[PDB]
Design an enzyme around this catalytic site. Structure first.
Site, PDB file in Angstrom:
ATOM      1  N   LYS A 112       0.809  -1.227   0.000  1.00 47.52           N
ATOM      2  CA  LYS A 112       0.000   0.000   0.000  1.00 47.52           C
ATOM      3  C   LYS A 112       0.846   1.282   0.000  1.00 47.52           C
ATOM      4  CE  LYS A 194      -5.239  -8.737  -1.669  1.00 48.73           C
ATOM      5  NZ  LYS A 194      -6.596  -8.151  -1.861  1.00 48.73           N
ATOM      6  CE  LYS A 197     -11.469  -3.110  -0.031  1.00 49.81           C
ATOM      7  NZ  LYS A 197     -11.272  -1.638   0.056  1.00 49.81           N
TER       8      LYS A 197
END
Ligand SMILES: Nc1ncnc2c1ncn2[C@@H]1O[C@H](COP(=O)(O)OC(=O)[C@@H](N)Cc2c[nH]c3ccccc23)[C@@H](O)[C@H]1O
Ligand SMILES: COc1ccc(C(C)=O)cc1
Lengths: 333, 321
Positions: A112, A194, A197
């Site tokens: 992140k 992965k 969203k």
């Protein structure tokens, strides 16, 4: 009383079929067997910078989506994280029993940070400690999450054990409930990464509120492999895209990997993608049909949040009172 | 009236330097400003300590501030943990504070010790604080709080006041007894300091041992460079009795340092008699302390809830039902 289940999801981005099969599917099946508590973690969501109107809408989207999946408000506690002050109160206390090295070595913070280089904020660094407070507040025994939250959950166990070693049996030591299938659902055009969203490339994602016809076109264009002849077989190392498609099909339908391999015996990737497209489209059509019925009923959504935060505060206040007594604060009266 | 915020640590034993310096300065300005004293028990736990001593130290600090002259009617005085909004805003402000900023503040350390400046910002910004008195060691922490306030305000409009430092110092000088170049601070060498709870016998013992000089004849005259010990004793006596330095020089004309020390010990203990009487009376009245903590938390929470609601409305959280 039953053992306690706690889990949460961020009202940020558009929740995917990854978020469903890694967490929300298990949430619905655990409701009778355990006392379940599910949270919209808006305080966690703001670690990535949000538009104020988009955050508010996403919170109510997420709540309606929980209800659409089958999360019954008469069986489970459903609440918004910021409506219960004890999450932040306990979170600060658990900072004092969480080490710096533990937080810096987290994978979620590193990925992140690299992704949002202009906003490497202290909340993003301190993410796992508030997550430990979310779990520990409700004397939680089981925590249904995806593969990506294994590391954060191990810290919550370490913090609970570290605190209990000094002060006694104040917290329960939580355990992971990660499923066999659908624990780590991968991106359609990049099988090694992965499913996100908030992916910049929308074609990687199968959104839960996304148009079924658009989702079918995305499954058809999912990358597979160069094997000759083409064979439908589960193999993450060599055949990552085909395996991800098998993993998605298995979880929607309920059928096992060897059952599906036998079903696609003498078949190729046309049959595989056709079955995934049909199975997933029927799921999202049924799910979205319930969603709008819940999402446009604001009086109902307001009542669920009202009742859930009320039920949650009773559990949360009791735990925080014991924490504050043990660490040695003067009790509020 | 401008709003002033002060974080009181529930750990240290306050000195006469703390009392006659900043604390006595602020006791007489309680009608001039809206003074807020927060006993910071949530900050304390960054350093691991005994639980029962922390509960004791909070009540010690409350009684001592009350004994020193802080008025529950005029000023708001409360325990930090009794107001949830501190923790709530502090998490919000974590998300608008750079990781780099906290690491730039001058493995085995706990996350609280890394992250307390954000809580410290939330402490100040909750109450629409205008002025914050600070030492040199806390100047960097106030500067972060101002950067956070301006950063947040620039995105969401004027939610917070940008706080300022309270510039004017007390005027009373109180240096360490065995090291008169060094300022007296709530120190490992406890013979350097006079605590507010010390009995007369201990004050005589410490002032007697306090260093002076080898001037022959011994002369009671003010000189910081040459006569640092004798000057500190004069400043201590001047701070207590209110007499000027030139008056005391005339008062101790042809007088040795034993006379000065005797008068300094008597004067300090005279000040600490009325102080200790108030402390032990307030400290052992459980109902009184409980009522002050309840009223102050109620006053604080009214201010704090209004600010947090504006913060939460600006961030975009769904409001509580
Ligand atoms: N590609 C994927 N495949 C399979 N599962 C996935 C995938 N992506 C995400 N998940 C899982 O979905 C849940 C929600 O993730 P969020 O990012 O919303 O949100 C998160 O990742 C949590 N930190 C939110 C949280 C906050 N406090 C808590 C306390 C207990 C449990 C969870 C929480 C998660 O369970 C996550 O494991
Ligand atoms: C772990 O949750 C946290 C809760 C509160 C804070 C403050 C007060 O800065 C920081 C982190």
């Amino acid at each position: 009383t039953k053992p306690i289940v706690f889990s949460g999801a961020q009202p940020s981005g558009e929740l995917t079929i990854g978020n469903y099969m890694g967490a929300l599917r298990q949430w619905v099946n655990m409701q009778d067997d355990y006392h379940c508590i599910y949270c919209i973690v808006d305080q966690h969501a703001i670690t990535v910078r949000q538009d104020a109107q988009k955050l508010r809408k996403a919170t109510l989207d997420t709540l309606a989506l929980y209800l659409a999946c089958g999360i019954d408000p008469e069986k489970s506690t459903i609440f918004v994280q910021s409506h219960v002050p004890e999450h932040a109160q306990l979170g600060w206390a658990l900072n004092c029993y969480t080490y710096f090295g533990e937080l810096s070595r987290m994978t979620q913070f590193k990925d992140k940070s690299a992704r949002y280089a202009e906003n490497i904020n202290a909340g993003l660094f301190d993410y796992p400690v508030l997550m430990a407070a979310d779990i520990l507040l409700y004397q939680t025994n089981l925590v249904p999450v995806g593969e990506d939250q294994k590391q954060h959950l191990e810290l919550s166990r370490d913090i609970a054990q570290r605190f209990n070693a000094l002060y006694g049996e104040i917290f329960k030591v939580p355990e992971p409930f990660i499923p066999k299938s659908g624990a780590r659902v991968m991106s359609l055009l990049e099988p090694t990464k992965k499913m996100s969203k908030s992916d910049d490339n929308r074609n990687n994602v199968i959104g839960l509120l996304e148009d079924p016809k658009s989702v079918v076109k995305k499954i058809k264009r999912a990358v597979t492999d160069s094997d000759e002849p083409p064979v439908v077989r589960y193999d993450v190392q060599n055949k990552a895209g085909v395996s991800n498609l098998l993993d998605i099909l298995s979880a929607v339908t309920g059928q096992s990997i060897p059952e599906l391999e036998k079903q696609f015996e003498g078949k190729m990737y046309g049959h595989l993608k056709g079955e995934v497209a049909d199975a997933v489209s029927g799921m999202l059509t049924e799910l979205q049909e319930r969603y709008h019925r819940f999402r446009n009923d604001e009086a109902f959504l307001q009542q669920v949040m009202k009742d859930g935060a009320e039920k949650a505060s009773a559990h949360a206040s009791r735990t925080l009172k014991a924490v504050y007594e043990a660490i040695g604060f003067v009790a509020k009266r």
